[PDB]
Structure formats: structure tokens, C-alpha cells
Design a protein around this ligand. Structure first.
Ligand SMILES: Nc1nc(NCCN2CCN(c3ccc(F)cc3F)CC2)nc2nc(-c3ccco3)nn12
Ligand SMILES: CC(C)CCC[C@@H](C)[C@H]1CC[C@H]2[C@@H]3CC=C4C[C@@H](O)CC[C@]4(C)[C@H]3CC[C@]12C
Ligand SMILES: CC(C)CCC[C@@H](C)[C@H]1CC[C@H]2[C@@H]3CC=C4C[C@@H](O)CC[C@]4(C)[C@H]3CC[C@]12C
Ligand SMILES: CC(C)CCC[C@@H](C)[C@H]1CC[C@H]2[C@@H]3CC=C4C[C@@H](O)CC[C@]4(C)[C@H]3CC[C@]12C
Ligand SMILES: CCCCCCCC/C=C/CCCCCCCC(=O)OC[C@@H](O)CO
Ligand SMILES: CCCCCCCC/C=C/CCCCCCCC(=O)OC[C@@H](O)CO
Ligand SMILES: CCCCCCCC/C=C\CCCCCCCC(=O)OC[C@@H](O)CO
Ligand SMILES: CCCCCCCC/C=C\CCCCCCCC(=O)OC[C@@H](O)CO
Ligand SMILES: CCCCCCCC/C=C\CCCCCCCC(=O)OC[C@@H](O)CO
Ligand SMILES: CCCCCCCC/C=C\CCCCCCCC(=O)OC[C@@H](O)CO
Ligand SMILES: CCCCCCCC/C=C\CCCCCCCC(=O)OC[C@@H](O)CO
Ligand SMILES: CCCCCCCC/C=C\CCCCCCCC(=O)OC[C@H](O)CO
Ligand SMILES: CCCCCCCC/C=C\CCCCCCCC(=O)OC[C@H](O)CO
Ligand SMILES: CCCCCCCC/C=C\CCCCCCCC(=O)O
Ligand SMILES: CCCCCCCC/C=C\CCCCCCCC(=O)O
Ligand SMILES: CCCCCCCC/C=C\CCCCCCCC(=O)O
Ligand SMILES: CCCCCCCC/C=C\CCCCCCCC(=O)O
Ligand SMILES: CCCCCCCC/C=C\CCCCCCCC(=O)O
Ligand SMILES: CCCCCCCC/C=C\CCCCCCCC(=O)O
Ligand SMILES: CCCCCCCC/C=C\CCCCCCCC(=O)O
Ligand SMILES: CCCCCCCC/C=C\CCCCCCCC(=O)O
Ligand SMILES: CCCCCCCC/C=C\CCCCCCCC(=O)O
Ligand SMILES: CCCCCCCC/C=C\CCCCCCCC(=O)O
Ligand code: NA
Length: 388
């Protein structure tokens, strides 16, 4: 049995290295949002709240985790706070991640009413409520769902603990049925699955909207061919009626409106000639639509396609952050499931427990890198902060 301080020295050194990187990276995130007005939006307010929780992981949760790894003597309820505060920060991160996904769904599914529905004041109230709810969820053991009524007295005496004290160890004071049923299943797994469903809806909405743009573009070009090779006025009228409904459907900003004003008006001009039985004159009037399509309509199609592809890319970046949260925290949750559900299984070894703990803490480091690599506005703001 090698001296415990040796293995503890590696674990403590790694934890402190994680804490430093978690503080610097996420302070840089908050500093960037504070300085750049282009980064000041509802989505990034939840990013800041997420960054604040990761800052608290380095300032508080990691020192708390180092403290509880020693098994020091402590009053059991004070031990619970040290043990459970990281659950407040993890829960707050989950609420921020869910809000970011929901915010991205509103912007892509109903962009016309997004700005009136999603405001900065309403976001601040949501952030405040989610932090209060995270304290209630994470500190639920302090409300009575704990093992403080059944302390390990033999372990407390062997450590020389005083009266009313226990050896402060995570699995000794925090019930595993809380950790699995309440914290993992209800408060972590279910919101994460809701996040996945929201992201599936986002990408499905983006894919559908892109296909609709290409469908209206095809409908515009197909019916033009129908008009050119029509032999009676009724055929020209049929295609023009479908184009007019498609043109108004694509219309659902001044150069935008003018280009569609010309398009619909030119369709109405040809429709009037078609109803008069003037086939040759209607087809020639419909040929003018090609000038409007090249000069105006195609530019709107490409810009609309460009805006949607940026929303997909922004939603992928946010989904990567949620996926990395799941990847970093799931091993610790899964180990707790083995400890709880399989008492006949040998406990996961010590080195694996602290590997899972370190990995969960590493998640507080990774988000600043995802923003820097995937969001130009952050990366450029990061550069200006560092240079100056
Ligand atoms: N489960 C857990 N533990 C800790 N810290 C204590 C580590 N010791 C756990 C006991 N063990 C052990 C016991 C008997 C053995 F035969 C072998 C062992 F190796 C030593 C090591 N911290 C945590 N945090 C979260 C957590 C936070 C969010 C989700 O889960 N679970 N968790
Ligand atoms: C706002 C920030 C800076 C304040 C940080 C306060 C932290 C460090 C304080 C608040 C409550 C404190 C705990 C309260 C009770 C106990 C029980 C005692 O037997 C050992 C210490 C222990 C476990 C304390 C450790 C430190 C502690 C967690
Ligand atoms: C989310 C992704 C990374 C999957 C994570 C898989 C990890 C967490 C899984 C894969 C294999 C698992 C181990 C397989 C077998 C045992 C032996 C048992 O006596 C205690 C648990 C223990 C030690 C498991 C702990 C959790 C474990 C390490
Ligand atoms: C987010 C994704 C990974 C879904 C989460 C799946 C979790 C809940 C699953 C994956 C593997 C599962 C474990 C696999 C094997 C065992 C051993 C058995 O003796 C008791 C149940 C137990 C311990 C399972 C509990 C639940 C478990 C941890
Ligand atoms: C032991 C005690 C430790 C203290 C833990 C306290 C945890 C609470 C921390 C909360 C940080 C939240 C920061 C989140 C800040 C988000 C920015 C914002 O909301 O502004 C948007 C509006 O201004 C626009 O109108
Ligand atoms: C935009 C800014 C956001 C501001 C965030 C607001 C700060 C949230 C603070 C919440 C405190 C509520 C705590 C309520 C949660 C219950 C747990 C508890 O209080 O246990 C402590 C005692 O049992 C000890 O004996
Ligand atoms: C404790 C953890 C540290 C947390 C610090 C949070 C600082 C957040 C500061 C960064 C957010 C400022 C902001 O969003 O302003 C927007 C307004 O200008 C609206 O226009
Ligand atoms: C800065 C470094 C502060 C860390 C100080 C923590 C010291 C505790 C220790 O190393 O012994 C306990 C372990 O042996 C567990 O058995
Ligand atoms: C900035 C805020 C300053 C905070 C500093 C706290 C750093 C960690 C200080 C924690 C030291 C606790 C300690 O030494 O206890 C020893 C006894 O248990 C021996 O029986
Ligand atoms: C800035 C805020 C301070 C950040 C981190 C503070 C670290 C908290 C560390 C908590 C130390 C508790 C302790 O060592 O007690 C030992 C004795 O009570 C045994 O009887
Ligand atoms: C997604 C859904 C995730 C939850 C499904 C996994 C549920 C895991 C339940 C394991 C269980 O019931 O064990 C009982 C026996 O081991 C007693 O010996
Ligand atoms: C939504 C907002 C949630 C906050 C609402 C109420 C917080 C009540 C906090 C009461 C904490 C007292 C717990 C206590 O000290 O009792 C000892 C322990 O519970 C026995 O093991
Ligand atoms: C979406 C999220 C999925 C949440 C589903 C949970 C089903 C869990 C049902 C477990 C049924 C009881 C298991 C049991 O009793 O065995 C545990 C044992 O007591 C340990 O010591
Ligand atoms: C990311 C970096 C990964 C490096 C992994 C090293 C960290 C932890 C595992 C080391 C084993 C330490 C056992 C803990 C002993 C103790 O706390 O008493
Ligand atoms: C990084 C700074 C070095 C920290 C060394 C940890 C030793 C503390 C200990 O085991 O008592
Ligand atoms: C993770 C680490 C990224 C940190 C890069 C250094 C920038 C620090 C500047 C700051 O604290 O604002
Ligand atoms: C440890 C906690 C550190 C939190 C870091 C958050 C920094 C971001 C915003 C805080 C507000 C900025 C305060 C100074 C503003 C001065 C100025 O605007 O020129
Ligand atoms: C920027 C502020 C961040 C706070 C830095 C604090 C760093 C201290 C790190 C670890 C504290 C470990 C506490 C040791 C527990 C005592 C061990 C024992 O009593 O047996
Ligand atoms: C439930 C916890 C309650 C917390 C009180 C926080 C105050 C929030 C009010 C603002 C609501 C909003 O504007 O959406
Ligand atoms: C851990 C148990 C969770 C607690 C369940 C219920 C606690 C709070 C419930 C809902 C808070 C709703 C927020 C509404 C605040 C008012 C909004 C407004 O002023 O417009
Ligand atoms: C529980 C596991 C799921 C965690 C992943 C959550 C969000 C990423 C969504 C992926 C996009 C489709
Ligand atoms: C390399 C990082 C960890 C990789 C795989 C985890 C597998 C650990 C399984 C060891 C079984 C522990 C035991 O004997 O109970
Ligand atoms: C001390 C271990 C810290 C490892 C952090 C890993 C996350 C950083 C991401 C890309 C480089
Ligand atoms: Na986090």
C-alpha cells in the first residue's frame, strides 16, 4: 500500500491544473461578451451563465473535491455542502445548455417572432430562476436526503474525529439512490434527452426550410419552361397561377421587396394577357421574368440559403458543447449506476473514480476552445483581448 499522499499528489496537481485552465478560459469568455456588442445577445447570456458555473468549478468545486478526497473530519451537513455544491454547478450548466438549444429552436422555427419573444430581460429572469432551481436540486441532500443519520462511527473513530463529526467522504454522506434516480436519471439524463430532441427538431427544421427554398426555385424555373412551350392560353395561365402563389410563398428588405414587386407584377401582366387569349403576348411577357430572376430573385435565394447554413453551423457548435458535457459527465454517472445497481460487483477502483472525477472537471475547460475554433466573433474578440 503505497503512501496515500503520493497518489493524492498526482490527483491534486491535475485538479489544480484543471482549475487554472477553467478560470482563465471562461473569464476570457465573459470578458469577450462584456466588451463586444456583437456578442451581446440572449444566446450568449446563457453562454455567460454557463461560463460562470465553470468559473465556480475552478474556484470552489475543485478545491471542494480536493478537500473531500482527504476524508477529513467534519460536521456531516457541512460535509454535504462540500460534496454537493458541484451538483449545483452541473445542474446550472444543464439548464443553460437546455436554454441555448431552445433559443436556437425559436430563432430557426419562428424567426419572425423571435425578437419579440426572446428578450434580454426575460433571459435574465430565466437565468436567475435556473440558478435558484440548481441550488434546490443540487443541495437536496442538505434537506434530509442524506446518510448523516447513520454515520460510519468506526471510520470516524479511526480518523480521530470529534463528537458529531464524520470522515467526510462523498459516498459515505451522499445517498447513491439520490445520485442515480434523482440527480442522474431525473435531473441530468432526462434534460439531456430533451436537448437531443430539440436539436433533432432544429436540424429537421433547417433541412425542411432549405428544401422549401430549393422547391420554390425549381417551381419558378420549371413553370417558365412550361410557358415557353405552351400551345394555348390555358396552359400559360396554369403555370402563371402556380408561379404567383410560389412567388408570394417565397416572399413570406427594400431591394428584396422591390424585386418581388417586379416579379408578382410581371406575373400579373402575363396573367392578364393569358386571360385575353393572347398566348404569344403572354409568353413574351413571361420571358421578362428571367431578367427579374437573375437580377433579384436568385440573390434572395442564395442569401436565404446562406443565412440558414449559418444557423445550422451555430446550432452544431452549441450541440457540440452539450455533447461534450454529456461525454465528460456520463462516466461518473455510469460508475455510480454500477455502485448502486450491482452491489455484487466489486467497486470501481480508486484510480478510475478519480479519473472520472477529473474528466468531469475537464469539461469546464473545453467550451472556450469550441467558441474560439467555431465562432469567428469570439475568436477575433479573444485575439483583441490577448493582444491588447
Ligand atoms: N461516487 C462519487 N465519489 C466521489 N468522490 C469519492 C471517491 N471515492 C469513491 C469511493 N471509492 C472506493 C470505495 C470502495 C472501493 F472498494 C474502491 C473505491 F475506489 C474511492 C473513491 N465524488 C463523486 N462525484 C460524483 C458525481 C457528481 C455528479 C455525478 O456524480 N459521484 N462521486
Ligand atoms: C462566497 C464564497 C467565497 C464563500 C466560500 C465559503 C465556503 C468556503 C465555506 C462555507 C461553508 C463552509 C463549511 C461549513 C461547515 C463545515 C463543517 C466543519 O466541520 C468543517 C468545515 C466545513 C465543511 C466548512 C468548509 C468551508 C465552507 C464550504
Ligand atoms: C460515455 C462513454 C465514454 C462510455 C463510458 C464507459 C465507461 C464509463 C464504462 C465502460 C466499462 C465500465 C466498467 C466495466 C466493468 C466494471 C467492473 C465493476 O466491478 C465495477 C464497474 C466497472 C469498473 C465499470 C465502470 C464503468 C465503465 C468504465
Ligand atoms: C446516455 C446514455 C449512455 C444512456 C445511459 C445508459 C445507462 C443508464 C446504462 C448504460 C449501462 C447500464 C449498466 C450496465 C450494466 C449494469 C450491471 C447490472 O448488474 C446492474 C445494472 C447496470 C449497472 C447498468 C445500469 C444502467 C446503465 C449505466
Ligand atoms: C458558496 C457561494 C458561491 C456563490 C455561488 C453563486 C452562484 C450564482 C452565480 C450566478 C452568475 C450568473 C451570471 C450570468 C450573467 C448572464 C448575463 C445576463 O444575464 O445579462 C443579460 C441582461 O443584462 C440583458 O438585459
Ligand atoms: C442573473 C443573476 C443570477 C443570480 C443567481 C441567484 C443566486 C441563487 C441563490 C440561491 C440560494 C437558494 C438556496 C436554496 C436551496 C436549498 C438548499 C439550502 O439552502 O441548504 C442550505 C441549508 O440547508 C444549510 O443548512
Ligand atoms: C461568479 C462567476 C463570475 C461571473 C461573472 C459574470 C459576468 C458577466 C458579464 C458579461 C455579460 C455582460 C452583458 O451581457 O451585458 C449585456 C448588456 O450590455 C445588454 O446590452
Ligand atoms: C496547494 C495544495 C493544497 C492541497 C492540500 C491537501 C493536503 C492533504 C493530503 O495531501 O493528504 C490527504 C491525502 O493523503 C488523502 O489520503
Ligand atoms: C481567496 C480566499 C482565500 C482562501 C484560502 C483558503 C485556502 C485553503 C485553506 C484550507 C486549509 C484548512 C486546514 O489547513 O486545516 C488544517 C487542519 O484540518 C489540521 O487539523
Ligand atoms: C475564494 C473562495 C475560497 C475558495 C476555496 C476555499 C477552499 C475550501 C476548503 C475547505 C477546507 C475545510 C477544512 O480543511 O477543514 C479541516 C478541518 O475542519 C478538520 O477538522
Ligand atoms: C434512457 C434510459 C435510461 C435508464 C435505463 C437503465 C435502467 C437501469 C436499471 C437497472 C436495474 O434495474 O437494476 C436492477 C437490478 O440490478 C437489481 O439487482
Ligand atoms: C425552489 C426554491 C427552493 C428553496 C426553498 C426552500 C429552501 C429550504 C431550505 C431548508 C434547509 C434546512 C435543512 C436542514 O438544515 O435540516 C437538516 C437536514 O435536513 C437533516 O439531515
Ligand atoms: C429517461 C430516463 C430513464 C429513467 C428510467 C428509470 C427506470 C428505473 C427503474 C428501476 C426499477 C427498480 C430497480 C431496483 O429496485 O433495483 C435497484 C436496487 O435496489 C439497488 O440496490
Ligand atoms: C486529464 C489528465 C488525466 C490524468 C489522470 C491522473 C488523475 C487522476 C488519477 C490518478 C490516481 C490518483 C488516485 C487518488 C488517490 C487519493 O486521492 O487518495
Ligand atoms: C501544482 C502545485 C503542486 C501541488 C502538490 C500537491 C501536494 C499536496 C499534498 O499531497 O499534501
Ligand atoms: C484554457 C485556457 C485558455 C486561456 C488563454 C489565456 C487567456 C487569459 C486572459 C484572461 O484571463 O482573460
Ligand atoms: C473570478 C471571477 C472573475 C469574473 C470575470 C468576469 C469579467 C467580465 C465582466 C465583469 C465586468 C467588467 C468590469 C470592468 C469593466 C471596465 C471596462 O468596461 O472598461
Ligand atoms: C482564486 C481563488 C481560488 C481558491 C484557491 C484555493 C486553493 C486551495 C486548494 C485546496 C484546499 C484543500 C483543503 C485541504 C483539506 C485539509 C486536509 C485535512 O485536514 O486532513
Ligand atoms: C423559482 C425560483 C425563483 C426565483 C426568483 C427569481 C426572479 C425572476 C423574475 C423574472 C422572471 C422573468 O422575467 O422571466
Ligand atoms: C427541487 C424542487 C423544485 C421546486 C418546484 C417549484 C419551485 C418554483 C417553481 C416555479 C418558478 C416559476 C417562475 C415564475 C416567476 C414569476 C415570473 C414573472 O414574474 O413573470
Ligand atoms: C444522453 C445522451 C445525449 C447527449 C447529447 C445531447 C445533445 C447533443 C445533440 C446531438 C445533435 C443531434
Ligand atoms: C484508459 C482509461 C480507462 C479505460 C477503460 C476503463 C476500464 C476499467 C476496467 C477495470 C476494472 C476494475 C475492477 O477490477 O473492478
Ligand atoms: C490538466 C488536464 C487538462 C486537459 C484539458 C483538455 C481540454 C482542452 C481542449 C483542447 C486542447
Ligand atoms: Na459546466
Amino acid at each position: 500500500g503505497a503512501p496515500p499522499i503520493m497518489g493524492s499528489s498526482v490527483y491534486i496537481t491535475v485538479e489544480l491544473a484543471i482549475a487554472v485552465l477553467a478560470i482563465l478560459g471562461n473569464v476570457l469568455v465573459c470578458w469577450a461578451v462584456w466588451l463586444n456588442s456583437n456578442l451581446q445577445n440572449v444566446t450568449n447570456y446563457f453562454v455567460v451563465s454557463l461560463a460562470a458555473a465553470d468559473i465556480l468549478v475552478g474556484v470552489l468545486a475543485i478545491p471542494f473535491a480536493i478537500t473531500i478526497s482527504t476524508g477529513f473530519c467534519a460536521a456531516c451537513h457541512g460535509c454535504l455542502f462540500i460534496a454537493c455544491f458541484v451538483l449545483v454547478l452541473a445542474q446550472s450548466s444543464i439548464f443553460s445548455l437546455l436554454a441555448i438549444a431552445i433559443d436556437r429552436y425559436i430563432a430557426i422555427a419562428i424567426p419572425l417572432r423571435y425578437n419579440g419573444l426572446v428578450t434580454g430581460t426575460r433571459a435574465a429572469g430565466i437565468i436567475a430562476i435556473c440558478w435558484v432551481l440548481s441550488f434546490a436540486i443540487g443541495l437536496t441532500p442538505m434537506l434530509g436526503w442524506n446518510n448523516c443519520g447513520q454515520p460510519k462511527e468506526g471510520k470516524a473513530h479511526s480518523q480521530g474525529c470529534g463528537e458529531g463529526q464524520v470522515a467526510c467522504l462523498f459516498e459515505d454522506v451522499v445517498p447513491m439512490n439520490y445520485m442515480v434516480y434523482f440527480n442522474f436519471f431525473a435531473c441530468v439524463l432526462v434534460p439531456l434527452l430533451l436537448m437531443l430532441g430539440v436539436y433533432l427538431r432544429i436540424f429537421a427544421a433547417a433541412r425542411r426550410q432549405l428544401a422549401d427554398l430549393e422547391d420554390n426555385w425549381e417551381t419558378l424555373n420549371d413553370n417558365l419552361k412550361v410557358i415557353e412551350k405552351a400551345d394555348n392560353a390555358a396552359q400559360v395561365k396554369d403555370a402563371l397561377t402556380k408561379m404567383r402563389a410560389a412567388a408570394l410563398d417565397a416572399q413570406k428588405m427594400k431591394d428584396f421587396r422591390h424585386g418581388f414587386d417586379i416579379l408578382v407584377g410581371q406575373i400579373d401582366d402575363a396573367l392578364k394577357l393569358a386571360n385575353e387569349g393572347k398566348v404569344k403576348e403572354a409568353q413574351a411577357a413571361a420571358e421578362q421574368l428571367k431578367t427579374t430572376r437573375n437580377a433579384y430573385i436568385q440573390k434572395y435565394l442564395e442569401r436565404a440559403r446562406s443565412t440558414l447554413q449559418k444557423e445550422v453551423h451555430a446550432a452544431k457548435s452549441a450541440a457540440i458543447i452539450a455533447g461534450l458535457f454529456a461525454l465528460c459527465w456520463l462516466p461518473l454517472h455510469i460508475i455510480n449506476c454500477f455502485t448502486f445497481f450491482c452491489p455484487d460487483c466489486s467497486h470501481a477502483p480508486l484510480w478510475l473514480m478519480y479519473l472520472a472525477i477529473v474528466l468531469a472537471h475537464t469539461n469546464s475547460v473545453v467550451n472556450p476552445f469550441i467558441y474560439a475554433y467555431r465562432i469567428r466573433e469570439f475568436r477575433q474578440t479573444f485575439r483583441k483581448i490577448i493582444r491588447s
